[PDB]
mmCIF file of C-alpha atoms and ligand atoms in Angstrom:
data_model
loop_
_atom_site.group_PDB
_atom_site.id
_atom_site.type_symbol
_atom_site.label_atom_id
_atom_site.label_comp_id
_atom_site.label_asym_id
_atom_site.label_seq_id
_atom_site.Cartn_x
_atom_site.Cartn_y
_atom_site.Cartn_z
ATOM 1 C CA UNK A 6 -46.136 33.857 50.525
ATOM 2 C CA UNK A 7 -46.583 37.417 51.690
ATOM 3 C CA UNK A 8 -47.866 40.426 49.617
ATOM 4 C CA UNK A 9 -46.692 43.812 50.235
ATOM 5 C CA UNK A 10 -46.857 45.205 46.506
ATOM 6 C CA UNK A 11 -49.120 44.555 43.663
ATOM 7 C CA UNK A 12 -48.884 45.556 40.470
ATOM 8 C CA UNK A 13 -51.759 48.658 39.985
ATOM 9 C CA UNK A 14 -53.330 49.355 37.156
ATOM 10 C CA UNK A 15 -56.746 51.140 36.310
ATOM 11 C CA UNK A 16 -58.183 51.450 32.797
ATOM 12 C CA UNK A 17 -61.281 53.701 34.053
ATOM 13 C CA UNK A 18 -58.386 56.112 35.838
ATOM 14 C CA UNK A 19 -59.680 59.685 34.508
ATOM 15 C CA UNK A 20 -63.109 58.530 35.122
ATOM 16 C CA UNK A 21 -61.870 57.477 38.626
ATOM 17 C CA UNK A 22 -59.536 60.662 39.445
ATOM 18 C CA UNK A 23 -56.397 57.863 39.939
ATOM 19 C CA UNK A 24 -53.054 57.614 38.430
ATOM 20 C CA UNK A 25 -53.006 54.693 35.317
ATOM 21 C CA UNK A 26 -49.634 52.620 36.280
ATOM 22 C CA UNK A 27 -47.573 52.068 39.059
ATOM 23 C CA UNK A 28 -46.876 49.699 42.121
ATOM 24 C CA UNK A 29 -49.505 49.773 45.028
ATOM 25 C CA UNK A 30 -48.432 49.071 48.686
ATOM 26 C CA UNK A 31 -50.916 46.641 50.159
ATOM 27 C CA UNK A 32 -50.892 47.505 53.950
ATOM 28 C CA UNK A 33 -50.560 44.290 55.494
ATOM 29 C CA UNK A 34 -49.043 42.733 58.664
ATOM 30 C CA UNK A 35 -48.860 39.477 60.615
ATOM 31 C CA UNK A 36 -52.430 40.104 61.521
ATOM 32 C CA UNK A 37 -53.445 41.812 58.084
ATOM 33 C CA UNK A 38 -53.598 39.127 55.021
ATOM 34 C CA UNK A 39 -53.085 40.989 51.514
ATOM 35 C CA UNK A 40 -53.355 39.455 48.266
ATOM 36 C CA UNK A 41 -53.396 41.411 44.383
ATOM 37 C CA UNK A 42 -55.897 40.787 42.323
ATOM 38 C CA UNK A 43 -56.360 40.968 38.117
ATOM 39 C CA UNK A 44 -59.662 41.912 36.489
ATOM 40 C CA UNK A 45 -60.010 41.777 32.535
ATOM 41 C CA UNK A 46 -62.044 41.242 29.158
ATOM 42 C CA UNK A 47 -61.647 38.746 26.551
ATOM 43 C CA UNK A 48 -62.778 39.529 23.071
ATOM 44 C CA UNK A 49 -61.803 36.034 21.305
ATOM 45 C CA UNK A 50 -58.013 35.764 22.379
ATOM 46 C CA UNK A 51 -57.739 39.936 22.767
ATOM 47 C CA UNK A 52 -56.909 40.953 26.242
ATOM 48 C CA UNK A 53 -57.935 44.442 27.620
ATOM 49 C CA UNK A 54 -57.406 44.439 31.274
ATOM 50 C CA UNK A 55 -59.926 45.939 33.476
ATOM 51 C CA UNK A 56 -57.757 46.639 36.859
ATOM 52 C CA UNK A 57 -54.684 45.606 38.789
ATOM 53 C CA UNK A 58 -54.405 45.880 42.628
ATOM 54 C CA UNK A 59 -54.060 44.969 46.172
ATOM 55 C CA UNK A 60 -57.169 42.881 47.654
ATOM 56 C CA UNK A 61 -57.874 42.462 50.983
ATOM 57 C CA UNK A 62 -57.855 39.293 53.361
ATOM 58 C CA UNK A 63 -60.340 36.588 50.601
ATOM 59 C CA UNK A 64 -60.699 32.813 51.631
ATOM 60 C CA UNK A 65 -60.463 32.739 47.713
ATOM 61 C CA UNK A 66 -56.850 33.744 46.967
ATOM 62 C CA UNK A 67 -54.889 31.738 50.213
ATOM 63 C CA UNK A 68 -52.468 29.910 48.922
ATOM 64 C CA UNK A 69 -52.349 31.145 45.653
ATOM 65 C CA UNK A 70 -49.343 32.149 43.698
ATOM 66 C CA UNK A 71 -50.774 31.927 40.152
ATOM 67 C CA UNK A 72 -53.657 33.989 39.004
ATOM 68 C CA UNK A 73 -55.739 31.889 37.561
ATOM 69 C CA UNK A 74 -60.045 32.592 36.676
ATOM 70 C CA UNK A 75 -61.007 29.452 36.952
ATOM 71 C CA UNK A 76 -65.220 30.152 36.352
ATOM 72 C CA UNK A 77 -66.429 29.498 32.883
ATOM 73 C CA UNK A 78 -66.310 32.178 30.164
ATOM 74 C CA UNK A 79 -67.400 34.988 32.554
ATOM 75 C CA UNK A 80 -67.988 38.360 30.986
ATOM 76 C CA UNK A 81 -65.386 39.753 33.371
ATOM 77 C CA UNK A 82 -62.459 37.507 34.003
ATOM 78 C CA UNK A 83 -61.379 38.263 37.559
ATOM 79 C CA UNK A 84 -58.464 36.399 39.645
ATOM 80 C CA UNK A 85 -56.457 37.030 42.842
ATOM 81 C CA UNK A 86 -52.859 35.873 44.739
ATOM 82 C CA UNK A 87 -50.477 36.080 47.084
ATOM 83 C CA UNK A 88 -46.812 37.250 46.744
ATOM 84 C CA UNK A 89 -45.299 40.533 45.072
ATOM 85 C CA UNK A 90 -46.330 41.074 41.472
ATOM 86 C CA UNK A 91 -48.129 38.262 41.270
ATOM 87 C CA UNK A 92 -51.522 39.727 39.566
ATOM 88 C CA UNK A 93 -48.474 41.008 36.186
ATOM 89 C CA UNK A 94 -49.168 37.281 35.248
ATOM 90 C CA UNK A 95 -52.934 35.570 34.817
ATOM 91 C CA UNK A 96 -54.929 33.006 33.643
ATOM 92 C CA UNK A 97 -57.974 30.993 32.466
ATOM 93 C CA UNK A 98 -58.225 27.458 33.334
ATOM 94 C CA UNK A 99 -61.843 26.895 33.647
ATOM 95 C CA UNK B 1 -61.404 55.080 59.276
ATOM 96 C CA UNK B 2 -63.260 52.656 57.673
ATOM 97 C CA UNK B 3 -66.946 53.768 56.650
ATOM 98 C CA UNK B 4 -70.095 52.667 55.363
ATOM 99 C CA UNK B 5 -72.622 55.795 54.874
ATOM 100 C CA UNK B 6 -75.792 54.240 53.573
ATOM 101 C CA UNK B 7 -78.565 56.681 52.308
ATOM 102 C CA UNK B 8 -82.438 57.453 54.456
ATOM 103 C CA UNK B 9 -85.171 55.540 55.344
ATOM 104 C CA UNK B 10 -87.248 54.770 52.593
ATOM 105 C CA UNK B 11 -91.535 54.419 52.770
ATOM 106 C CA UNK B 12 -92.925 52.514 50.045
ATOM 107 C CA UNK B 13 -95.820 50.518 48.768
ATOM 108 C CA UNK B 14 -96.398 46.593 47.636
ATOM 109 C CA UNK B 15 -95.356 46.155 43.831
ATOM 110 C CA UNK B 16 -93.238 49.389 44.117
ATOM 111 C CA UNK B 17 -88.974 49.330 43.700
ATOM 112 C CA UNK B 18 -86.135 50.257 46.509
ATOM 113 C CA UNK B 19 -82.569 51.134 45.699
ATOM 114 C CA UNK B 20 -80.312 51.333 48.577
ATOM 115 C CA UNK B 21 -77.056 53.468 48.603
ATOM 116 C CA UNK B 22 -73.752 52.544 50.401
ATOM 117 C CA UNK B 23 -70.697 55.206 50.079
ATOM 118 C CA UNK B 24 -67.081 53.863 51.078
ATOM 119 C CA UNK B 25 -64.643 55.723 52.851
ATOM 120 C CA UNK B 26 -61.531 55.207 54.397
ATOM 121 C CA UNK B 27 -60.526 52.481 52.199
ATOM 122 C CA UNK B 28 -60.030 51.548 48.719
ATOM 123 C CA UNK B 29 -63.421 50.607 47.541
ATOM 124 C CA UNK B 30 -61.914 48.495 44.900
ATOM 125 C CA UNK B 31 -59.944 46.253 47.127
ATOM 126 C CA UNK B 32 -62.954 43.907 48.606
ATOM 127 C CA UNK B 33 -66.502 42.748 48.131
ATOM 128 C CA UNK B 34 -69.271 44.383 48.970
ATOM 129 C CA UNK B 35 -72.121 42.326 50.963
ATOM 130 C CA UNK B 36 -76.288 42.732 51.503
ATOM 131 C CA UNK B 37 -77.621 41.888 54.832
ATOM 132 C CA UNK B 38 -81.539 42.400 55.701
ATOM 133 C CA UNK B 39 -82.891 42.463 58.780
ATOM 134 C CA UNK B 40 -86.703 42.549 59.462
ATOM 135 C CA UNK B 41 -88.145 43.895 62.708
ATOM 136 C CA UNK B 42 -87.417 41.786 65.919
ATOM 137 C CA UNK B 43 -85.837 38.745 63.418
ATOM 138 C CA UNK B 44 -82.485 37.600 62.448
ATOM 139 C CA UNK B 45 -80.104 38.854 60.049
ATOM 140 C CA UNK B 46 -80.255 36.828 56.602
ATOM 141 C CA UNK B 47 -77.790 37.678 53.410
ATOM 142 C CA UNK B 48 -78.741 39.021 50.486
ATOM 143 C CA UNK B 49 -76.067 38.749 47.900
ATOM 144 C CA UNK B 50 -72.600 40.149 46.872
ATOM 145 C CA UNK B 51 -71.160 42.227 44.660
ATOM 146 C CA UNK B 52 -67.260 42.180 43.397
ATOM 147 C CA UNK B 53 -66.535 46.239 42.564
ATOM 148 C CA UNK B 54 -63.676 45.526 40.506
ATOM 149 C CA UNK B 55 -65.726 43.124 38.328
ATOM 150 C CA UNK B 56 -68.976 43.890 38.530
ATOM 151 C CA UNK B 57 -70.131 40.500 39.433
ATOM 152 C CA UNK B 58 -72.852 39.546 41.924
ATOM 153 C CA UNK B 59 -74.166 36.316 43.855
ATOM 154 C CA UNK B 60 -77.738 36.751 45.538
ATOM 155 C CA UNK B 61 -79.240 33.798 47.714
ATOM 156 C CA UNK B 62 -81.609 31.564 46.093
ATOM 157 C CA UNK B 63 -84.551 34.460 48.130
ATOM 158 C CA UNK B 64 -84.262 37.043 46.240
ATOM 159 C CA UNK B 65 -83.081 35.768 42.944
ATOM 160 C CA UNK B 66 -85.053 37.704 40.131
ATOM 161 C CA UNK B 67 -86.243 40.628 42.795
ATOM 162 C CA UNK B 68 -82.307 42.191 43.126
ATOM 163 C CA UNK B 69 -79.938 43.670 41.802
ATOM 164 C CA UNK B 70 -76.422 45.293 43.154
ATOM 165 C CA UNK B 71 -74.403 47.623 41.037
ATOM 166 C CA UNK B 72 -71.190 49.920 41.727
ATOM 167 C CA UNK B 73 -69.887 53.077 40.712
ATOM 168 C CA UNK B 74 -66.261 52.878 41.678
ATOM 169 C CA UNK B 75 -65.664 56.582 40.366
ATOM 170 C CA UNK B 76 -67.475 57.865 43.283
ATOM 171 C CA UNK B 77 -67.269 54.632 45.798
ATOM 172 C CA UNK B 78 -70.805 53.428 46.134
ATOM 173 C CA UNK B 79 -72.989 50.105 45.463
ATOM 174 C CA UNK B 80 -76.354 50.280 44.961
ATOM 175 C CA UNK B 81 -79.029 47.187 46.052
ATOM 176 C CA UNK B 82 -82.296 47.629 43.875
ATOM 177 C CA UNK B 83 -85.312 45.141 45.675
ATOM 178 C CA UNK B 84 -88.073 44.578 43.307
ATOM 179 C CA UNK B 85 -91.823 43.823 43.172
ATOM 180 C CA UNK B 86 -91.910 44.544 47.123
ATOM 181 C CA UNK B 87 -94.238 43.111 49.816
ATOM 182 C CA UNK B 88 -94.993 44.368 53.104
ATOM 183 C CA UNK B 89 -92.452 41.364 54.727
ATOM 184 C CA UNK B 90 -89.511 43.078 52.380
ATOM 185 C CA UNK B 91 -89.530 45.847 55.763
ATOM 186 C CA UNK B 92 -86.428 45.242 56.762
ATOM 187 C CA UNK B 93 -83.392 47.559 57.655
ATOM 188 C CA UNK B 94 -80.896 47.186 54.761
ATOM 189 C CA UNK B 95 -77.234 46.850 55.583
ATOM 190 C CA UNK B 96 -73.907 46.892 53.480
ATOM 191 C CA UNK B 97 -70.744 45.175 55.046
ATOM 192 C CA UNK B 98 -67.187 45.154 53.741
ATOM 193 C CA UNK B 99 -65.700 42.032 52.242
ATOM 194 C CA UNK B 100 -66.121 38.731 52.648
ATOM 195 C CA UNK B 101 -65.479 38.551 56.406
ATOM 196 C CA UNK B 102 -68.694 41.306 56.746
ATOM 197 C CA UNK B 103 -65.640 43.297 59.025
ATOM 198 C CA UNK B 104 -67.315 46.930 58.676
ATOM 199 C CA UNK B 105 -71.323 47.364 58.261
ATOM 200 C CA UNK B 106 -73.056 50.392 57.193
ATOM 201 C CA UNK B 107 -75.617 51.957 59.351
ATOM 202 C CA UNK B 108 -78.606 50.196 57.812
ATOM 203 C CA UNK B 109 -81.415 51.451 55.782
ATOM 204 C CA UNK B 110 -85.246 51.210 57.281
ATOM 205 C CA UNK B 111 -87.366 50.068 54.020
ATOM 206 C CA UNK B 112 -90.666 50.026 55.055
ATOM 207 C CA UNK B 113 -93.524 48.283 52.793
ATOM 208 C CA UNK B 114 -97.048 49.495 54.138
ATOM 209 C CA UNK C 2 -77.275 25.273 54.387
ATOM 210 C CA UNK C 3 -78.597 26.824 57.311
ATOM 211 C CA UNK C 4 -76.413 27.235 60.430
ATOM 212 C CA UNK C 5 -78.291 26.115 63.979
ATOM 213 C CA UNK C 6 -77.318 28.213 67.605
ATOM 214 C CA UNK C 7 -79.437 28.300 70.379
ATOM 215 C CA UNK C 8 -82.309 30.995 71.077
ATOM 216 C CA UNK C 9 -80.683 31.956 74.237
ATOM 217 C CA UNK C 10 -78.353 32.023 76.816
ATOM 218 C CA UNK C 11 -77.823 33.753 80.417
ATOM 219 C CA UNK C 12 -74.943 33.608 82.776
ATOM 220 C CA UNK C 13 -73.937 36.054 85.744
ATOM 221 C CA UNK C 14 -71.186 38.479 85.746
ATOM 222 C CA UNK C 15 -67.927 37.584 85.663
ATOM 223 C CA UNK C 16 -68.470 33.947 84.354
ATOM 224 C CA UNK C 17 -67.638 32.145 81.013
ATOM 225 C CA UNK C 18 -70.291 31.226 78.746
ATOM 226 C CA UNK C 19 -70.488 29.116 75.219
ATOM 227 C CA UNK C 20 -72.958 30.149 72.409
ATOM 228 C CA UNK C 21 -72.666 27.655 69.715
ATOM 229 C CA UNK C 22 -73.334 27.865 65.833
ATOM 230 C CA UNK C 23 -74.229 23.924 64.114
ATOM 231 C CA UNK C 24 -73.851 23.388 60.485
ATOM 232 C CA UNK C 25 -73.053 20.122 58.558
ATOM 233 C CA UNK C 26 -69.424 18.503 57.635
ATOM 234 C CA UNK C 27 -69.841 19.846 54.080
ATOM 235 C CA UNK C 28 -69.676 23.451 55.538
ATOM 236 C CA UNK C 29 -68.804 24.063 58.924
ATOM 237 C CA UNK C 30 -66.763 20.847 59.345
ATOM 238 C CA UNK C 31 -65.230 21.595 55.871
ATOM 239 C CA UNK C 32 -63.698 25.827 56.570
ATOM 240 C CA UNK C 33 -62.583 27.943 58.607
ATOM 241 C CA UNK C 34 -64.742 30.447 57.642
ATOM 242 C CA UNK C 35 -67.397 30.748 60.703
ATOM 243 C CA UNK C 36 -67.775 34.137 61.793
ATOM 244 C CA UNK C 37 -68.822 35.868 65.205
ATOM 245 C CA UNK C 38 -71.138 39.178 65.266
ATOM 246 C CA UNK C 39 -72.575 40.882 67.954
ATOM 247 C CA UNK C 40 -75.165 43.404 67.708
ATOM 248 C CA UNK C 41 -76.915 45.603 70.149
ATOM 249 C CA UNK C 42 -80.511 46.554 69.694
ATOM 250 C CA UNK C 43 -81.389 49.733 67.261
ATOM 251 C CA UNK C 44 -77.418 49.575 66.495
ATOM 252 C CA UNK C 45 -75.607 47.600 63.127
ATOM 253 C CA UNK C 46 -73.893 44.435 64.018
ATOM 254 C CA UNK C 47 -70.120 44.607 64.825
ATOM 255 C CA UNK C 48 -67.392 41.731 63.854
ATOM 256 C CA UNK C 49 -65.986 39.862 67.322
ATOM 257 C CA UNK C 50 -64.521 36.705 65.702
ATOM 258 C CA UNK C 51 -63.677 36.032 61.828
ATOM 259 C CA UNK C 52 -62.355 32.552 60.773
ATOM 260 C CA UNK C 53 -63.528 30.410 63.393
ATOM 261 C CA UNK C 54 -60.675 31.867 66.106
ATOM 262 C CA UNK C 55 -59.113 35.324 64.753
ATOM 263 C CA UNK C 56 -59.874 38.221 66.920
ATOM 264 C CA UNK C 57 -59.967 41.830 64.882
ATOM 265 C CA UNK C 58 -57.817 44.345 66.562
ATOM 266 C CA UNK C 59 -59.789 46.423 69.131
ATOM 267 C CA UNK C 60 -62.093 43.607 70.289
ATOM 268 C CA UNK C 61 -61.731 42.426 73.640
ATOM 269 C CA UNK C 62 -59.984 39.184 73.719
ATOM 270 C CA UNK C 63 -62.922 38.110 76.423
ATOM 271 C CA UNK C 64 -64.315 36.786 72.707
ATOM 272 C CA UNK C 65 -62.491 33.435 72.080
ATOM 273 C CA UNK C 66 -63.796 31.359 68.924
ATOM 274 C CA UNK C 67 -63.346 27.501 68.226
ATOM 275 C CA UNK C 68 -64.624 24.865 66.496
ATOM 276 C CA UNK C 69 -64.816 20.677 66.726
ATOM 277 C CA UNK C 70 -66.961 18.873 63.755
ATOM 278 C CA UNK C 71 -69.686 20.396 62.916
ATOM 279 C CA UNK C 72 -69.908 23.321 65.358
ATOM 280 C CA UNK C 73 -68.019 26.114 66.004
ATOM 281 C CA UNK C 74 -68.369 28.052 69.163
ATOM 282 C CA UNK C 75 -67.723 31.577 70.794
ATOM 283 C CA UNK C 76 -66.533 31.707 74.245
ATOM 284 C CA UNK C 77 -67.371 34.954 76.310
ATOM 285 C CA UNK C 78 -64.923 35.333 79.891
ATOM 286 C CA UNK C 79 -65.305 38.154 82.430
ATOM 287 C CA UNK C 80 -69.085 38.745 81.358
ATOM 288 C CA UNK C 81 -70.075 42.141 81.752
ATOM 289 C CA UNK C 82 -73.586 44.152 81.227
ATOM 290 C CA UNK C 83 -72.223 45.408 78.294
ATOM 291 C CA UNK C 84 -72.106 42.130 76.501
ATOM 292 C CA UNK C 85 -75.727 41.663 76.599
ATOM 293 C CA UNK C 86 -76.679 41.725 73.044
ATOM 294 C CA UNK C 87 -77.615 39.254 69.861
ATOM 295 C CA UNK C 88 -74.870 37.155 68.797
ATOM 296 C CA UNK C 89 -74.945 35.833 65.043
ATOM 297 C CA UNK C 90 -72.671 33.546 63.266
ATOM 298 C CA UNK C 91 -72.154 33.539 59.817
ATOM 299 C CA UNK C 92 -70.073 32.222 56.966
ATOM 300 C CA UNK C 93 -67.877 33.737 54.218
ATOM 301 C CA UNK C 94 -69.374 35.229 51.075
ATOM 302 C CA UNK C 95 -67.819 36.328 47.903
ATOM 303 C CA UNK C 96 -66.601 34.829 44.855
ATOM 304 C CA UNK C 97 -67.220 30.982 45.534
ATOM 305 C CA UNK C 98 -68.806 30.968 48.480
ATOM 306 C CA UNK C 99 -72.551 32.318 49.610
ATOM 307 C CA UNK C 100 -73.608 34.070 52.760
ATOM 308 C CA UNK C 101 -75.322 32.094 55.572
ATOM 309 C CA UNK C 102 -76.187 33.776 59.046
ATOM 310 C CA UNK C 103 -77.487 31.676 62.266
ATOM 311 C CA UNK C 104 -80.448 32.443 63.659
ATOM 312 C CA UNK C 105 -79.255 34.151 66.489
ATOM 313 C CA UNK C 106 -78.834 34.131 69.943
ATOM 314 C CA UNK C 107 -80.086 36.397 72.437
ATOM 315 C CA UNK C 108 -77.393 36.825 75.253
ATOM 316 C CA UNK C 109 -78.719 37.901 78.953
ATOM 317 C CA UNK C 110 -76.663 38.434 82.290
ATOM 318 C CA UNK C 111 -78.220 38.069 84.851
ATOM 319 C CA UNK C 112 -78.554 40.018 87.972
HETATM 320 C C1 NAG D 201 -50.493 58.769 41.989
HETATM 321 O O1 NAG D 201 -49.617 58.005 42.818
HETATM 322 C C2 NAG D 201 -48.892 58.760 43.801
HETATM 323 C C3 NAG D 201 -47.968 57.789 44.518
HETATM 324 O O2 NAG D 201 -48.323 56.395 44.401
HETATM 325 C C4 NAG D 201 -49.866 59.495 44.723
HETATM 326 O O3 NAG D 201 -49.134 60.324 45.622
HETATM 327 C C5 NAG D 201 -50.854 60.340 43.914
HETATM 328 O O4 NAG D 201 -51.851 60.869 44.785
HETATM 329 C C6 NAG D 201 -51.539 59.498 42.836
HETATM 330 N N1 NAG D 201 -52.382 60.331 41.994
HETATM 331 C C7 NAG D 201 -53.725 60.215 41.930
HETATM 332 C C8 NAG D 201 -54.412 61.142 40.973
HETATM 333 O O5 NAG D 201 -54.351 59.398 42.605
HETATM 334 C C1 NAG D 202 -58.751 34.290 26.478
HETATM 335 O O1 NAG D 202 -59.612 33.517 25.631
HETATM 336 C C2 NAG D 202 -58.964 32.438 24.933
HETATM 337 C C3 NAG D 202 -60.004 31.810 24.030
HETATM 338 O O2 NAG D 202 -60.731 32.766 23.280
HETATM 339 C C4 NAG D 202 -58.366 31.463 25.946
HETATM 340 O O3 NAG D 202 -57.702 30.396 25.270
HETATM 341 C C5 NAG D 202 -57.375 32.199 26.843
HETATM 342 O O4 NAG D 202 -56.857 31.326 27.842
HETATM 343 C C6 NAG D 202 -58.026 33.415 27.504
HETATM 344 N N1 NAG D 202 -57.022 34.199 28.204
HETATM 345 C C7 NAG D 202 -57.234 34.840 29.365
HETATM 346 C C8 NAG D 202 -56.011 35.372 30.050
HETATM 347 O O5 NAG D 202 -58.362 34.991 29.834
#
């Protein structure tokens, strides 16, 4: 699967001077492996995601189309993909 | 293009703290790891630990467990690497390196511990 | 686990020569994740070879990297003067897996 858009999405955005929501390019090619990624916190069940966004070329994401965290109860859940969109949907499965 | 502008040779003494700088440019710093490489004079290079911006999580090797610590500040692109309760062997030239494949290093950073 | 190669090496110009980087099955003959770094003295080092054979794009594809078992090696054709340097392998790191560089190997061509 290859990624050429992520979802983006950045919680800290007027701290960071970007834009809050939108679709990122990831700049790959046949020599330039992309994947998205999904960052978040977990306050018993309550979601508050972190960031959304293209990540570059990580041994950790090949072959991935689910975005899944699978390290246990981390203080910031973090998973990563490959394939359009596919950071909109995540996981724990520790 | 991609950069990795680490801050100025540092002089300090035994017992004494170290915190490195490492700006990004050219790049998204949010879209990869961040890595620590050491080097000591006329020896090999030897990792230090990572860092995952977007996160905030960090790995250090077994070494310097205890003795580091790498932070970000993704608002103005940087990661900091803080060595504690230094010894003369900690002089070393410091590097940062982009992601996981280490596929753009900083200048280094000259720590010497007299 | 640490990663073995060779103190040194010397050919003559224009020949082929094979640095090697030894781990054990549980790393090296496990991933593809050896990596290739050269690095001139006084200077930072510079990525030749990521993922045991993938070249970045403005290295000279004189640097060839392989692996069988345990070992993975670079391959340097045409050598030039300029290639004298340090070559280090190293593995991966982030996430799941931690940093390991080879000693190093000092490269000399000899006139
Ligand atoms: C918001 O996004 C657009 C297009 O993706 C870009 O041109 C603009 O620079 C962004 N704004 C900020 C503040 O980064
Ligand atoms: C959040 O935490 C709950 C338990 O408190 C767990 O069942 C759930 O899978 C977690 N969700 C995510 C997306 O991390």
């Amino acid at each position: 699967s290859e990624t050429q858009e992520c979802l983006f999405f950045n919680a800290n955005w007027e701290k960071d001077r970007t834009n809050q929501t939108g679709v990122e390019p990831c700049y790959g090619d046949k020599d330039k492996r992309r994947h998205c990624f999904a960052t978040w916190k977990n306050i018993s069940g309550s979601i508050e995601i972190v960031k959304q966004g293209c990540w570059l070329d990580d041994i950790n994401c090949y072959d991935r189309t689910d975005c899944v965290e699978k390290k246990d109860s981390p203080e910031v859940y973090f998973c990563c993909c490959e394939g359009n969109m596919c950071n909109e949907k995540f996981s724990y499965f520790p | 293009q991609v950069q990795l502008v680490q801050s100025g040779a540092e002089v300090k003494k035994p017992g004494a703290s170290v915190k490195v700088s490492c700006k990004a440019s050219g790049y998204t710093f949010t879209s990869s790891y961040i890595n620590w490489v050491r080097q000591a004079p006329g020896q090999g290079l030897e990792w230090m630990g990572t860092i995952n911006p977007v996160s905030g999580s960090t790995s250090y090797a077994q070494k310097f467990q205890g003795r580091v610590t790498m932070t970000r500040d993704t608002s103005i692109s940087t990661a900091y690497m803080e060595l504690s309760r230094l010894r003369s062997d900690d002089t070393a030239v410091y590097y940062c390196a982009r992601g996981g494949w280490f596929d753009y290093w900083g200048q280094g950073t000259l720590v010497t511990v007299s | 686990s640490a990663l073995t190669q060779p103190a040194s090496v010397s050919g003559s110009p224009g020949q082929s020569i094979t640095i090697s980087c030894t781990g054990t099955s549980s790393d090296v003959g496990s991933y593809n994740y050896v990596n290739w770094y050269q690095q001139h003295p006084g200077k930072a080092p510079k990525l030749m070879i990521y993922g045991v054979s993938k070249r970045p794009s403005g290295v000279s594809n004189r640097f060839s990297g392989s692996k069988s078992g345990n070992t993975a090696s670079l391959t340097i054709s045409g050598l030039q003067a300029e290639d004298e340097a340090d070559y280090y392998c190293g593995t991966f790191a982030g996430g799941s897996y931690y940093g390991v560089f080879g000693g190093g190997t000092k490269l000399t061509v000899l006139w």
